Amino acid sequence: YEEAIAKVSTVRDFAQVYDAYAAFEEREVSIMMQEVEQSGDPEEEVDLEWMFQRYQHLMERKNELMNSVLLRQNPHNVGEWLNRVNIYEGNYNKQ
Amino acid sequence: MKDFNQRFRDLHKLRQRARKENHEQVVEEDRRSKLPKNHEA
Amino acid sequence: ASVDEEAKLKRYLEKQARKEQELKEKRKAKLEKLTAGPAKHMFEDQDYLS
Amino acid sequence: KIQINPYNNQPFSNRYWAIWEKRSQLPVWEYKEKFMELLRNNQCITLVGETGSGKTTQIPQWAVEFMKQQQQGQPPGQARLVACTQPRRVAAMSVATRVAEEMDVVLGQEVGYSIRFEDCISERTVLKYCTDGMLLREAMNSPLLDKYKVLILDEAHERTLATDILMGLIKEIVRNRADIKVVIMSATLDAGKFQRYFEDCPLLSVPGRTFPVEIFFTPNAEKDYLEAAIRTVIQIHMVEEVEGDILLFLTGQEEIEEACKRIDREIQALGADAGALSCIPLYSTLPPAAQQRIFEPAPPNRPNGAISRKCVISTNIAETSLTIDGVVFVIDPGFSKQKVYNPRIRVESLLVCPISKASAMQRAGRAGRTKPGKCFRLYTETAYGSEMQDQTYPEILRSNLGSVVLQLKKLGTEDLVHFDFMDPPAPETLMRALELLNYLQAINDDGELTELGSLMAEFPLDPQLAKMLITSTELNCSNEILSITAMLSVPQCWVRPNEMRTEADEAKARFAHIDGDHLTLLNVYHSFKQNQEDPQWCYDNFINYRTMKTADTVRTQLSRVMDKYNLRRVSTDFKSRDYYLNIRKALVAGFFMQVAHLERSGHYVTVKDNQLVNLHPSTVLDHKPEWALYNEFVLTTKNFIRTVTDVRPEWLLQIAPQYYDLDNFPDGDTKRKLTTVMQTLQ
């Protein structure tokens, strides 16, 4: 999934890959949560919360990744490079 | 521990949000693919 | 010919009469149509939706 | 002189005497002794009297005494009631409140009302106001209306589906329960068709307007009415020296929002000399705050003596039950939108159609309530006599009878083809009705109500919706489906002031679910619940706060209904893959007939009837789904299928087996698509 999003060249294709990827991440979080709700093992709760970090990270990546896909279709599109700068609003150096 | 359950419900909501927003960019892109560059002149 | 030219002159004058509200409206109609810009596309790629 | 109140044993209060003087001056009052004799002599009465004739307030009160006198010198027998129906909820309340004053007893105690979602009776109630549907709702449990002694079917002119059904059954009741009085009132002068229908019952005519009205016509026939109406408004504003507001009748929001704007332009041209004209739109889907303007008083006028005026531009909502005070100029272009449901193609239409010889009166009758007044019709007097038909069709000759046939079957009418309608429905419509019910398992092939059918009647819903909701309880989605039921049984919750269209549509997008308008409403309903039902959140997101508060009420009622028949409210897990899958399947269970597919030409055609349709542009879809489930086939400028939903054709064959049975189908594209799916599922 990570390689696909780095190499997919259309928004039409990307909306399948990322939507499938977020769906995949959800079931893994689900099954693991339902196990921890019965296991109670704190190391599994640690890794469950470690897994929630990774799932939440993928949502933030979405706006960065969507714009990056657009800056591979036509990276002359200076309107989308302004959006790229707005995605990195939290990082002056990356701007 | 309901804290994870409460966190999960927001994340699925937020996944659904990105589900639509992705689809918004698809229909946008389809129009752009129909137009090509003559539109800009 | 006197009947026809009287009618034709009248209809020439009647089109010329108040040639401004139509022109200003038709200019207004054109202006707002262009500025409205993007209509929604509503694409049909049903096999993608499948 | 101390009279005792017979109901509470009190001296009649000091307020009553003053009110008594004024009500003695109502026109109906002289007839008081005359009415009682007729009621004593006959079982059915037809009564007619113009607006302001006091019928609605005095007649039911006189009915009450007549009940009492019949109890005097008999034992105090089983508690019986006098009913007064009222076509609209707002009217049933506004009458009762006045009438609970007049009889100097506490509202809900001896004098009451019984409308939807609020019952104000007590065991001491003798006189019960109810909306028409509630007297239809009672009969379905108690066919002879067993609690009732004197019925009173007010405002008969409105001919609503509740009323047309009632009248027939009530004439059937007039057989059988041979003790019950009926007093059919009509406020329009109507050509005594009521008098025939009820076995030549005695007709009582009572006059009684408040002021006289002037009627006016254009001598030539203007060809663009809105240009005329707008031009008429300006002309009146400038030339009339009498103070007063202008009430202009247009067809709808596409025009009442245009007419406001263009009238504002010309008053901005007329500048300082002319008085200030304030233009107020008024149509049934304006949010509460926008409606409330109509109560606002006029400016204090400009200093030069130029009269400032309020101009209320309104659909037929100003014709009936809404009483706009201060109107002394009515402009009547002579049109209204009329639904007409074409039972051949299931196209329900909304075209601009000419009003009737009655409706023309009622529009004019707005003037003459506070002082004499003038009505200007933008049509010629010969046009009036010879194109406008004499009264507008009843509701029953106009609408889908699914809701009604099921009600009649529950009431134990088997003989629908002899049912005694005053103006019977078209043969072709009833054949859709039975066909609608027969697919839905409401009725078996010999036409008796089946077990599933009898439950479908119990819901305050249309037949399609009831089949959805019941079936939703076996798909484990009833809590989600219950809301999609509630939102579709109330007038649509989207607000779109055309001054703010782009911003309002942006709010609509944020709600939008991807799979269509039915999940978009469930998103809307949930969002309203999350925000503590705060009125403000309704406003900025352009959602009518009336609709949602009505909708949430409807939901609570349907929950109560489900419990009484042990339909468990359930949900699929939000975590589950099945959650949004189980919602869409339930829809398809019940609107399975009303499904479209996308033909190769780029248009939709509706399943079996080959009717050519387009997505109604309000839909929050951004794609044409290949198979589209839709709730309302609309004629305006084109056929438009509204409230469109993406469905997957596998559901159609599994969930709704009868109708999509391939062997019957008309040979065409619809059949070609369906066939391939069934082979795939096998």
UniProtKB/TrEMBL annotation, chain A:
Subcellular location: Nucleus
Similarity comment text for this entry: Belongs to the crooked-neck family.
Protein name per UniProt: Pre-mRNA-splicing factor SYF1
Organism per entry: Caenorhabditis elegans
Lineage, top ranks: Eukaryota, Metazoa, Ecdysozoa, Nematoda, Chromadorea
TrEMBL record, chain C:
Compartments in which it is found: Cytoplasm; Nucleus
Highest taxon above the source species: Eukaryota
Protein name: Replication stress response regulator SDE2
Entry similarity comment: Belongs to the SDE2 family.
Annotated transmembrane regions: none
